[PDB]
Amino acid sequence: SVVLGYGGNQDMSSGNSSVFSNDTGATATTFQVNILQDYDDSAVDNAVINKGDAVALIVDVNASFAGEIPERTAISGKVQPEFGAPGVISFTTPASYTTTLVELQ
């Protein structure tokens, strides 16, 4: 059972491409934050999401679980905010890996 926290690295990639190719080297105990949409630039500094943003999270698995994640598994998890209601995770893995970028949910 693994608890994470915020990591001191982010990006302002609103216009660029290749999500898996920029600033992914500050992992192994934290997650990383990317911004996809922000009109009134309220999330560029100090991480405040207003009504209508879009933010992606990147987590590394190999350097945080000390191993891998094989197929035919079932994993739950929660993303508890400070005071709201959590979103629940379920990504029961497919039985075959084909391409270099697989969908999970």
Partner 1 sequence: STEQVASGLLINGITGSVGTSDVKLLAIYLAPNAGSSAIDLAQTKVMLDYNGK
Give the residues lining the site for partner 1 (CB under 8 A): 17-18, 20, 36-37, 39, 54-62, 65, 67-70, 73, 75-89, 91, 97, 99-105
Q: 64 — phi, psi (to 5°)?
A: -125, -25
Which of partner 1, a second copy, none does residue 91 bind to, with CB < 5 to 8 Å depending on kind?
partner 1
- Cα diameter, the chain: 43
Closest to partner 1 by CB, 49 or 57: 57
64 is a site residue for a second copy (CB under 8 A)? yes
Distance CA 40, CA 42 (A): 6
72 binds, among partner 1, a second copy, none (CB under 5 to 8 A by kind): a second copy
